[model samples]
Target: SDKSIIVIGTLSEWLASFLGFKMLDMDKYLFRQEEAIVAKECFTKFSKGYVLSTGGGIVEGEDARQQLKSYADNGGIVLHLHRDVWLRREKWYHECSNYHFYSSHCSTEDEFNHLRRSFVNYIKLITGAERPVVPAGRSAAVVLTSPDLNEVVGDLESITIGADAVELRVDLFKDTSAEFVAAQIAVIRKHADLPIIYTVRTVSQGGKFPDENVDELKSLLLLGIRLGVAYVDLQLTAPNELIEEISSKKGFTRVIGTYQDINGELKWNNVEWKNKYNQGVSMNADIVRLVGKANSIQDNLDLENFKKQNTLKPLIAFNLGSQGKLSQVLNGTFTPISHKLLPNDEEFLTIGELNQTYFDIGGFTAKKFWVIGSPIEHSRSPNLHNAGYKALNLPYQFGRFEATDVDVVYDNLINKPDFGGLAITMPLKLDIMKFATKLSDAAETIGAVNTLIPIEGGYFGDNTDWVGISNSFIRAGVPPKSSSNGLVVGAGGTSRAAIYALHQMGCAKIYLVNRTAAKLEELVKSFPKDYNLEIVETEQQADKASKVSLAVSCIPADKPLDGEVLKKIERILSNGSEQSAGFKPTLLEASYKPRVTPIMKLTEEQYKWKVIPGVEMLVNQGDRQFKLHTGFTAPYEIIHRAVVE
Candidate 1:
């Protein structure tokens, strides 16, 4: 009883046969029957629809014809398509009422051409009350009319092209001009009276219209509407004000807003098109349409998924181009057809139809998580962290949120149970520290929190940067008892964390350098003078930087240290061997920017020293943070794999 079906065949011949059937635009019943037998059986089970297969041969032999007839008699649809479906039957050489055979004996190429055209015409006759079949052996074209006994309807061809913007090219000079359209409509009026809806769009929504002008486009739309055409299809991006103005003047004109996926793939970005559909409905359009092929059966199913996600409006869903024809028929219970016939053998249906099929089939459930901050999309933390979660069999979902206001983020977390935790990045890290109910000793020492965990009353804030830094130093083979002469560049939160980490590692003394002594002085007040921390106030003091073994630069890549500062650090490291210091200090640059920071490059070029990347700091910190946040010991291998992968 289910309406959906799948059609499948071997690569080359099967695809061609499928295309032949698609061009025909057969009766919905026949189409369903044909699709039920050929497609993969798995899809048939999932869809609860029949699968039709040609099995690399004709589907119109006497036995096959009887099977098709019985199916149709039983209310089953038949999507009779194959090279032989159009082959001239010996008994009906000239008497076949439905078919207009071009030649009895033709080459394979000729037969294919004839079949392509003949099939299109045959479908028109079957589906339309007053079918306008373009004579066989001529250019292939057909018009579909309503099944209503009184009306003759002209076939409306909607053409969309792919480009940056939706452009309509209307050339009155071309053979397929306004006059041709009027004549087609007139022919329908003479036989079965029905209006036409024609659309010519650019490829941006996934069509082939290129280099179209706006004036020509406006003329085409206006002219069609003025003639009382059934509907005028417009791209979603068209100025709504113009569309509104046109609708006001012509009350009979129905606007069909269209969206197309030209990329032949389904992605989260399709949400934008859905937004456009809402906009179209707001502008008083009669229907919102989406045109594009479902690149795969899954893609077709995803369309139904989208329909389920949205339920307020009527949607005319169809797959355009070549691959998505079957999707046109697999409509859910909510979707409805927009118009009866179009040149392209595209099927349309309402959201209701789409929903029924989707629910019956089911699909994968996506995991959800979010990062809240302005321009959060740039953060790679989710990619790394989620990979770890996946490795650990945890459902992983992560997204970005540009919530600059901290209160809003706090409120969102309290209200949205789906939000797991917070990755406090820059700008918000310090502000969020004030809201934490409990702070770790490391957080207190660092004076900032980079991770927020929801607790009984509020969030528990902790700083893992120090753990990350300390662990990184350890991984770099820096022994805890190594000589304590160290140089730390910059004086931000990260720099402070690096300082505390070095202190933890038993560094005897650390030299902190900055362009201004004021910031460094303010920062050092938190540390005891007894901690043996020295602030270098001048370039001269920095130049003669003490017998430092390790130099860790926290400066951003954009704010590179002067070559002079680099020379001073190099002199300090180079002279450490000459001094009474027992070991050479390894330089570590903690700047994450540019992937390869300037200081890292200078360290390599000047001292032939290999420096640890800032990502190493992130990875080590994240690993420790994960362990702290979750009671389980964080998997370092998983974290490392996530970071690099």
Candidate 2:
């Protein structure tokens, strides 16, 4: 359900079966039936959102059909691929939302599903779907929680295996009895030997226990302290007399007093998180904790800075956003979670997300790398590279710096030792080379640089894109041949790398596809003057494209291809001349953002070409970039696993 869309229907599953990413891991991933949120408890969990699925066809009545429309009318992500066959089943069956055609055998009125592969085609279309990645291994420690006695104890056998420390969240026992709380504590102690924190959250603080249970809650927590649990946490709202009693009587078990602003962006300044810390300490508790929400990824990182300064009594603080999971990832010690557990919209490191915490959370000072470009945010380079850092156990960080002026970042950050490397992208890919202190022969030959490594005075630059493209083909086991002709799309740094990769692989002749005549001419001229290469700009010139056996498109999906440009790409990629017959060229679409590029559509669905998505290109180049920056081969399998859809 963490998926961007709660993709519903048989067609959703059918679509996955059709494209088959090398091999789709369907049973493990697509196991859930996401027809609807099922209940309100699941409703609030999806904030960044989802694409809710519509069963391939509505049943004969308006009952199920109306609900599908309601979710869409509410501005939810809905996918209804029901068409002609079902449409003819009922003319009154009204529905409309981002609908398209089945590119196969049917009167134009056929269901998109009947087209099968076209349904696969329609799923990707030119519409880019961005699938976000969760952290792989745990880097941050997580505290697992449960409200029911048998439920917590039942889950503990499985939870303690890959757990940081389990906390018994006793916030909702109806019978606030001493014997009941004691028996539950006894069961957990009997279940595992790991550290345990005893916490009872009150209803006023977004917890399960009602307001009337305050005195009973105090008595329950007092017993936990007496039982010598690893820690006992009380909300800052707990009575002063109760804190004095428990903190004074607590033995080796630590007492944690916590405050929360759980709903919105933490508007507090340094003084606010600090005052909360000071307030927790003054309550006679041994430790302090602060939890809040972050508005964006940037605010989440800022909260990490906040926690570093507010260490009064070994403070724990974090803003609860989806990105909130990032807050104090390096330091926040399982901030006394004031909640009962198992799957809520509330974002934090719950037991389900606890496995993800095993991945890097910036726990130490780290070297920084940037994926610099105007439309850079959608880039997955950070996932691949940072994951590589964690797998290698190196203290390195990678982030996207959405900047048009690469030189500005270079002038400002290049001198720092922690400023490790740079991954160049469109517009800046070639422009950044002017600022490079040294250029490798590969960079000089490709006339562009995609990777930059720090040098003594400034930086050294080279083209790892060639390795990414060429090696991607080799890894996929269909490398291009010198006897076969090839195609290179767009006139930019990546296209330059493509031409070099093809030439290096010994392609017979290379064809250039571009819009601007001048830029196209400039691109070819930059390559070896005598290399067998030609140009294709319009439908009239597309005959040359049919002969090419391998192709790579450098035009980005972020900057869409439209009208004539879009048509031209289609003609060249899917409709080359009769002489081009025997060649089934492989295509590597280099725009990783949309995950599937426009040419990818024409290449895969239209021509049935062997398709290599930009994600592979992202990792292949990132592997080389990682090695250049850190002086070690990137743990490529982990990098590959992290980014491969």
Largest TM-score belongs to which candidate? 1
Tens-digit lDDT track of model 2 for 15-97: 33222211112223221223333322222344243233333343335554455455445544334332226335433232333
For 143-232, candidate 1 gives per-residue lDDT tens digits of: 232222123221121111000011112221133354344344333322322234456565565444443455655655665653444456
Query: Candidate 1 at residue 637, lDDT?
Result: 48
Find the 10 residues in a row with the least total lDDT in model 2: 17-26
Q: Return the TM-score for each candidate structure.
A: 0.41, 0.40
Off by over 4 Å in 2: 1-366, 400-402, 456-458, 480-482, 537-547, 556-584
Q: How far is candidate 2 from the true structure (C-alpha RMSD, Å)?
A: 20.3
